Design an enzyme around this catalytic site. Structure first.
Site, PDB file in Angstrom:
ATOM      1  N   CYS A 179     -14.712  23.297  24.752  1.00 16.62           N
ATOM      2  CA  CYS A 179     -13.694  22.438  25.318  1.00 16.62           C
ATOM      3  C   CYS A 179     -13.472  22.750  26.793  1.00 16.62           C
ATOM      4  CB  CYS A 179     -12.395  22.644  24.550  1.00 16.62           C
ATOM      5  SG  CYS A 179     -11.170  21.357  24.813  1.00 16.62           S
TER       6      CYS A 179
ATOM      7  N   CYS B 226     -12.813  11.953  27.145  1.00 12.10           N
ATOM      8  CA  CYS B 226     -11.842  12.907  27.658  1.00 12.10           C
ATOM      9  C   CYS B 226     -11.189  12.359  28.912  1.00 12.10           C
ATOM     10  CB  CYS B 226     -12.512  14.263  27.930  1.00 12.10           C
ATOM     11  SG  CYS B 226     -11.416  15.625  28.447  1.00 12.10           S
TER      12      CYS B 226
END
Ligand SMILES: Cc1cc2nc3c(=O)[nH]c(=O)nc-3n(C[C@H](O)[C@H](O)[C@H](O)COP(=O)(O)OP(=O)(O)OC[C@H]3O[C@@H](n4cnc5c(N)ncnc54)[C@H](O)[C@@H]3O)c2cc1C
Ligand SMILES: CCCCCCCCCCCCO[C@@H]1O[C@H](CO)[C@@H](O[C@H]2O[C@H](CO)[C@@H](O)[C@H](O)[C@H]2O)[C@H](O)[C@H]1O
Ligand SMILES: [S]
EC number: 1.8.5.4
Length: 407
Positions: free
Chosen positions: A160, A356
């Site tokens: 991440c 994202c």
């Protein structure tokens, strides 16, 4: 009649519960069990971490909202899961039986992977949860009163990466917006990525160039192919490798204020179930989101296992993001309802993808990539005020839905 339990009220869990209840109706029992009694919008955490949002902005009490929807809620952590007896032992020692189980526990933040790295044991902090990011902020003001070096990035085995970049930029930003930026000895970026803007997906659009240039514009030195061996004495011990793994150097970085994205593991209660998970603690599900070892256990979200497509010099993983998690949820819901109705559920997660959004303040960065291997069908990286607008709108939207219900 059946009892469906959804474990973990996070990004996949809170919706799964609303949906599950919708699909099944007054005919069946739906129970949401989660460690915390409130929901939190994760994407907003780096902002808490630098002090742009308060907790009360991005989190709220789960209970009322789900109970008004026929869903029972237990603010209690699952300590144990017996897949045989189909019982869950709670934190308080009480147990709970289920007919079908839906695991949405998200990640264990594997600090232990790097001794000293736990935000409670030293200066390396975390913005993955609101508690932790509130912590980060505290330490940030400690840096303000007493300026020293800064280290931000992602640990080995992380998956991440975005929020690290985001956090680096917004901290950079926030210093200037205080003028205190030139009071900083050094500002360093450390990442397990084989290159900047790899983001665990072999890059999307021009993420390499744009992130590389950003870190430069902000006077942040960047090292790649790094793993932290240990944090100790407020110093970050760092090993850098080449494409073969041999060592090209070793660093000792003094840290006064730092944030590193930790590797994710499956949570204990879930990783503990025999035969359920891979060594990482991730549930081995099929394309229908059903466990390969228990027919009445489904899994969605970060909790599920996804095979790697590439092996990087320093261990890294691919992120599991919002949109794909929703697909996971809804599929599993459909396949379970189908199970209480004779059919086998045919529904799937869909095409692998990553989406994202990062807000730097006035404008933002976003990417869409699908599917997982290049050449992709969609490979886009964008920056612009409009991305900021969208993040704000999406945060407002998602939080409302988590109060009103979903279908
Ligand atoms: C900082 C950061 C920013 C990100 N930003 C974005 C982004 O911009 N866009 C996007 O698409 N994705 C984003 N994500 C990725 C991802 O969408 C989020 O992490 C998302 O919250 C994942 O949802 P989840 O349901 O799988 O896990 P979570 O939301 O973390 O939910 C897991 C839940 O299970 C609970 N739980 C764990 N163990 C137990 C137990 N033993 N008993 C009971 N409950 C338990 C936890 O308390 C939690 O409520 C980001 C991730 C991070 C961390
Ligand atoms: C979403 C997760 C992944 C990333 C997380 C955080 C990323 C960090 C942000 C880096 C951006 C900094 O650098 C910034 O980028 C773009 C480069 O395209 C530049 O912007 C440039 O393209 C944009 C359009 O996309 C134009 O609107 C602009 O006129 C032009 O100058 C900015 O002039 C520069 O200031
Ligand atoms: S992520």
């Amino acid at each position: 009649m059946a009892h469906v339990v959804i474990l973990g009220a996070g990004t996949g869990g809170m919706p799964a519960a609303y949906e599950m209840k919708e699909a099944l109706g007054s005919g069946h029992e739906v129970t949401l069990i989660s460690a915390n009694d409130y929901f939190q919008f994760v994407p907003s955490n780096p902002w808490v971490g630098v002090g742009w949002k308060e907790r009360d902005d991005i989190a709220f009490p789960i209970r009322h909202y789900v109970e008004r929807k026929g869903i029972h809620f237990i603010a209690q952590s699952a300590e144990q899961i017996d897949a045989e007896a189909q019982n869950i032992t709670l934190a308080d020692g009480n147990t709970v039986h289920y007919d079908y189980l839906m695991i949405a526990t998200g990640p264990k933040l594997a600090f232990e992977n790097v001794p000293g790295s736990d935000p409670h044991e030293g200066p390396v902090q975390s913005i993955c949860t609101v508690d932790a990011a509130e912590r980060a902020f505290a330490e940030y003001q400690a840096l303000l009163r007493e300026p020293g070096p800064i280290v931000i990035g992602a640990m080995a085995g992380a998956s991440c990466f975005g929020p690290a970049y985001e956090y680096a930029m917004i901290v950079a930003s926030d210093l200037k917006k205080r003028g205190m930026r030139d009071k900083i000895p050094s500002f360093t970026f450390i990442t397990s990525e084989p290159y900047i803007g790899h983001l665990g997906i072999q890059g999307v659009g021009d993420s390499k160039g744009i992130l590389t240039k950003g870190l430069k514009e902000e006077g942040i030195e960047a090292y790649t192919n790094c793993k932290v061996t240990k944090v100790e004495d407020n110093k970050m011990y760092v090993t850098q490798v080449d494409e073969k793994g041999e060592t090209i150097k070793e660093m000792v970085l003094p840290v006064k204020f730092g944030m590193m994205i930790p590797a994710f593991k499956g949570v204990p209660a879930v990783a503990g179930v025999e035969g359920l998970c891979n060594p990482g603690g991730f549930v081995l599900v099929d394309e229908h989101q059903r466990s390969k070892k228990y027919a009445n256990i489904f899994a969605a979200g970060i909790a599920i296992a996804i095979p790697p497509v590439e092996t990087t010099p320093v261990p890294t993983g691919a992120p599991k993001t919002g949109y794909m998690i929703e697909s996971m949820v809804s599929a599993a819901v459909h396949n379970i309802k189908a199970d209480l109705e004779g059919r086998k559920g045919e529904q799937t997660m869909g095409t692998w993808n990553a989406v994202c959004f990062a807000d730097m303040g006035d404008r933002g960065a976003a990417f869409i990539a699908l599917p997982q291997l290049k050449p992709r069908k969609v490979d886009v990286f964008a920056y612009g005020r409009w991305v900021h607008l969208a993040k704000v709108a999406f945060e407002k939207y998602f939080i409302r839905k988590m109060k009103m219900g979903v279908s």
